[PDB]
RNA sequence: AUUGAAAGUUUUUUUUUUUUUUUUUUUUUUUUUUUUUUUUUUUUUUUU
């Protein structure tokens, strides 16, 4: 997923002595970051599970775990990256066009396109 | 080619200050890195070109290579901006690791003579 | 030839590094790894030596082993700088691995001597 | 001037087909940009 509307800024963080409070032990790393907000180029393709029809039984369970991963990306939305505890990063799919391309009848050409939204 | 006006630009750069206690260059690497961050958090050329001047009318900056990074910076493009300021960066921090001596880098114009004087 | 060079080059780069509490070669196989994949990635050779500058300047580069470096590589073909970076890669890493002392490999110019070297004992 | 000789071991036949160096593997785990500094001193709401 490249970006396009991307900006890098640059925060420094500085440890603090717990004993005499305030003095920096020199354990000042500056890193290196994106903006809060930027589009990126998300395409995924899943083969063998139908999700806008549904399995109906067969190995089932897994259409469930990934409509619950795909609700929680666009919802909530997953934390990757390198801190990830002091809240950097934090990705989230605002919408993505569902295409559902089908051997037997047409495969090239999509059979079904939906918004992720209605998917979920 | 990109690479001479770099060299350029950091042996302009590389000019001791004058009125200092200790030999050091006129300008610091903190700037350098200062001005690439700037760069990438903006994305433009113009308000960099801006904060150029801002710096160079503070001090810290050598009004002759103020006025070459003016006139390279004057019209390029934002990757080709990048590059230069890249380039610049790399080859202060070259200069100042090897505690080369201005009087000896001040006939240079080139990267390829620059390049011979490091390696006799 | 070009082996000669590597040899004397990884000669240089495997010195051992003062105030280190550790024997070590001046340099790491790290540093012959990225100055690889720099040159395979940036396909320039201008480009490489600025990385190499940089690398002698964060002084973790034996400022002999950069001179030899920068005078090798100017004036010197693509194909021609990747065969002998693969050959200083090389060398250096058969030091590495039969860890070689520094003191009694010193004093070797030619790829020849050091084969003769390695094979006597 | 051999009992005495004059005949290419030659024609002809593709070492070819089947097979994706492939699957799995988040460059993350930790660190408060704080810290010492009084917007202070000088000046008569006033004369022919």
Redesign the interface.
């Given at each position: 997923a490249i970006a396009e509307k991307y900006?890098?800024?640059?925060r420094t963080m500085v440890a603090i002595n717990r004993v005499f409070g305030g003095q920096m032990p020199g354990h000042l790393y500056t890193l290196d970051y994106v903006?809060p907000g930027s589009e990126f180029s998300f395409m995924m393709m899943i083969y063998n599970l139908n999700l806008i029809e549904g399995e109906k039984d067969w190995k089932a369970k897994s259409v469930e775990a990934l409509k619950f991963l795909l609700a929680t990306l666009v919802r909530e939305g997953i934390f990757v990256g390198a801190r990830k505890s002091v809240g950097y990063g934090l990705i989230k799919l605002v919408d993505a066009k569902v295409s559902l391309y089908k051997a037997p009848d047409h495969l090239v050409s999509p059979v079904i396109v939906k918004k992720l939204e209605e998917v979920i | 080619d990109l690479?001479d006006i770099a060299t350029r630009i950091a042996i302009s750069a590389i000019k001791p200050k004058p009125k200092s206690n200790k030999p050091e260059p006129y300008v610091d690497s903190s700037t350098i890195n200062s001005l690439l961050?700037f760069l990438?958090?903006?994305?433009n050329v113009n308000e960099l070109l801006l904060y150029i001047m801002r710096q160079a009318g503070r001090d810290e900056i050598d009004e002759e290579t103020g006025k070459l990074l003016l006139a390279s910076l004057k019209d390029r493009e934002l990757k080709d901006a990048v590059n230069l300021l890249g380039?610049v960066k790399?080859?202060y921090?070259?200069?100042?690791?090897?505690k080369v001596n201005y009087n000896n880098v001040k006939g240079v114009k080139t990267?390829?003579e620059l390049?011979?004087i490091?390696?006799?």
């Open positions: 900006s890098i800024s640059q903006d | 690479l961050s990438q958090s903006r994305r380039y790399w080859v921090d070259t200069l100042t690791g090897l990267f390829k390049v011979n490091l390696s006799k």
